[model samples]
Target chain A: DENLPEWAIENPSKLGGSFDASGAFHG
Target chain B: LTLKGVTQYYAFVQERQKVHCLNTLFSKLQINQSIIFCNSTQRVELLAKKITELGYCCYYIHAKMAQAHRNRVFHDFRQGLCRNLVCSDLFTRGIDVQAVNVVINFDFPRMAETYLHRIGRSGRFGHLGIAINLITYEDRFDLHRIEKELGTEIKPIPKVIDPALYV
Candidate 1:
């Protein structure tokens, strides 16, 4: 499971919080 | 991920520990070869770098990196590029590497299936293997609870405990 999902992307956000917010929906 | 940083952390923790099941395993194996499987890439890399620095070559593989990286790491394993190897759950999945007489679980696997993969890495082809878990109070709690829930006792480093031996 440590293998990151193939469809997932490590998106970087400038505001930081935008990227941080995605954690709420992480599988 | 540098070799220097890996050695510092792993040597520090191992030196401060009371029980080293790997040492016992080596004695029983009568062979100076085995593998260490940690819970994450960070832990696996640390242990691999440390032991390699101590004159024992080790291979470190993790899943967080690209697939090419994973392939290269395992390729080195096939070539016997190291005396010992360190890996994450990714490497634990369905690897039929021979000459692995011992498996060291530096951290306890959370799920039963994950735990199986870690231990299943060894004792292969009818060869015996020793599975050692560097159990802490937190890990002990999880193991105890999971076993009760699943009706199976997880493999560990046997009866050994140390206050300073934890991540």
Candidate 2:
């Protein structure tokens, strides 16, 4: 039941920016 | 009537850590009541002050609150401590809030999805609830189109007033 992006749950400091680890960058 | 986890993914993990270097280095601490999230501190403060003056418990999350502080707000909310919380959008992160009965959107949401998310906070677990949207001037066009898309008309209930005041 975890809908949160991994980057958010782990490091919320990066929020409000594009460095979201959950971003679709790898694909 | 019951509900189980309906999502495709579920997991439970336990992690432990220890702090070797603990310090009592002049730590200044303050104890307070529960928490809630509002959209702005000024508005939150006003409401908080009113509630307190009325002999109810209240608090506000100011601009000075850190991420950890906001996270703790939800935790405190779930614990039945403070009676009301006033904050802005900062507390809407991935926090586990439950049993909220009502929510009021005093200002129009910036986007349709933002509106959806804000209201979705309520009615969790298949519970019934209501949302009140106070739409203001200038956005009537967009709202009318929204009504059209829903195949419904937005009707304003007529109010009685002095004939001279009717313009």
Candidate 3:
């Protein structure tokens, strides 16, 4: 019943402590 | 209380990730036509520009714009000239656009009244629609406050939003 997106759960922090989040995304 | 036909949800996103999240939504969601709300006139224009840069057609309207120009923009949008419109909470009332099935709060409104008016733009005439909020850490408190104030539940957006909810 929880509708959490996978990416959100994976990297929960804003500054990306777990993963310095960078992907093929528009700036 | 939540509208029976509307499914409301919020995304916990970083400020820097907001644009990417919006792009992902543009790629994934079934948006017939969407009314995206920002908190300021500057943001309304900025987001519209970004959407255009991303190659999506968008029209923006806010209080700073001339009334006649705003009217023309809204009129043309209602006529199906564009698929998305970026606007501020300046003119939240009476935006009875039935084709608009998606409402994204790019900047969440602080007041429950404003939030209600913003989301009400969708799920028109008792038809199914969806409202997505880009809730940053700073906005987290308001999220709970507004949810409590309105006596409504705004679940976290799922990995994949079901089409049956808004399509």
| Per-candidate clash tally | 0, 6, 0
Docking class of 1: incorrect
What is the CA-based DockQ of model 1? 0.02
Tens digits of lDDT, candidate 3, B56-116: 9999988878887888888999999999999886643345687888989988999998987
Residues B3-85 of candidate 1 have per-residue lDDT tens digits of 11110111111212312323333333334456676766766665665454435677777777677777787777767776677
lDDT of model 1, residue B125: 32
Local lDDT at B70 for model 3: 83
Worst ten in a row by lDDT for model 3 chain B: B119-128
Q: What is candidate 3's CA lDDT for residue A12?
A: 21
lDDT for position A24 in model 1: 16
Q: By DockQ, who's the top model here?
A: 3
Predicted complexes: DockQ each: 0.02, 0.02, 0.05
lDDT of 1 at B61: 75
Candidates' C-alpha lDDT: 0.48, 0.37, 0.75
List of clashing residue pairs for candidate 3: none
